[PDB]
Amino acid sequence: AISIKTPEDIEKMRVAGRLAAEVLEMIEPYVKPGVSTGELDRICNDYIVNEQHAVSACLGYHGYPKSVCISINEVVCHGIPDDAKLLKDGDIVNIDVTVIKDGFHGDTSKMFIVGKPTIMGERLCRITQESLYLALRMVKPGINLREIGAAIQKFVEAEGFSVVREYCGHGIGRGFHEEPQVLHYDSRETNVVLKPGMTFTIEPMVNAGKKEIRTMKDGWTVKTKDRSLSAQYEHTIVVTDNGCEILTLRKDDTIPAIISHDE
């Protein structure tokens, strides 16, 4: 059931969302050529635990081995931090974070371009973040989630990219994943009219090539079937009386934290 968060819970969600975003702001200086994804994960975990006094919702979830998910280039999601995996110039890397604090979850991720960027890499990431932004600008009471999914897809496909169908955004609160499902493409099964108090994520996964994906034998790593690049950005938001409030905004975001549609 889609729950409406109380003002009190929403504040707890702001706290958790801020922490999740700060993990990403903290890790920035470390995302450099030569660094291992394994070390990046250890830095985030130490920060979450020793500094934020929070916990990673990913650790142990369905047996997931690390504190954050780190996906590089062709890897679509659930990449596993590994000490032998080194970042290099041109890489596009997603670091996905979910922390629990005072019982509530903050879920967010962003792409990082390592060293000297590649134009195609920058473009994929830019378009992906823009697809998230256009969706955020649509969130307000009364709108149907299907309209947002359709808009994300239209935009992405127009750029010659594709949207991954296997994964979606989700309601969030005392639980990591709660109703409703937030598809990033058009579907007849989607009929969710938004209302104030609802909290959920928007996190499109976009492939530069075809939408098809495959999972590696490690049981976790998901890559694009055609080995094209894939990018993802995610934000946790709360629907307000006249729009929405992004709970995981970072200083590098270029969209307002509070979006209002009132005159």
The footprint of Mn ion on residues 27-46 (CB under 5 A) is none
- The response to whether 98 counts as a known ligand-binding position is yes
Within its chain, how far is the Cα of 198 from the centroid?
17
User: Judged by CB under 6 A, which of 69, 80, 125, 213 binds ligand A05?
Assistant: 69
Residue 107 in contact with ligand A05, rule: CB under 6 A: yes
User: Judged by CB under 5 A, which of 94, 190, 201, 224 binds Mn ion?
Assistant: 201
Residue 96 in contact with ligand A05, rule: CB under 6 A: yes
What is the 3-state secondary structure of the chain?
CCCCCCHHHHHHHHHHHHHHHHHHHHHHHHCCCCCEHHHHHHHHHHHHHHHCCCEECCCCHHHCCCCCEEEECCEEECCCCCCCCECCCCCEEEEEEEEEECCEEEEEEEEEECCCCCHHHHHHHHHHHHHHHHHHCCCCCCCEHHHHHHHHHHHHHHCCCEECCCCCEEECCCCCCEEEEECCCCCCCCCCECCCCCEEEECCEEECCCCCEEECCCCCCEEECCCCCEEECEEEEEEECCEEEECCCCCCCCCCCEEECCC
- Determine the interface stretch with ligand A05 among 56-64, 129-137, 183-191, 210-218 (rule: CB under 6 A): 56-64
Residue 23 in contact with ligand A05, rule: CB under 6 A: no
Q: Which residue is nearest to ligand A05 (CB)?
A: 62
Q: How many residues does the chain have?
A: 263
Residue 253 in contact with ligand A05, rule: CB under 6 A: no
- The response to whether 170 counts as a known ligand-binding position is yes
- Tokens representing 231 are 């990018």
Residue 96 in contact with Mn ion, rule: CB under 5 A: yes
Residue 230 in contact with Na ion, rule: CB under 5 A: yes
Residue 77 in contact with Mn ion, rule: CB under 5 A: no
Q: Which is nearer to ligand A05, 62 or 188 (CB)?
A: 62
- Tokens representing 256 are 């307002």
245 binds, among Mn ion, Na ion, ligand A05, none (CB under 5 to 8 A by kind): none
Residues contributing to the annotated binding site: 78, 96, 98, 107, 170, 177, 203, 234
Residue ranges in contact with Mn ion by CB under 5 A: 96, 107, 201, 234
Residue ranges in contact with ligand A05 by CB under 6 A: 58, 61-62, 64, 69, 78, 96, 98, 107, 170, 203, 234
Residues contributing to the annotated binding site for substrate: 78, 98, 177
Residue ranges in contact with Na ion by CB under 5 A: 71, 75, 230
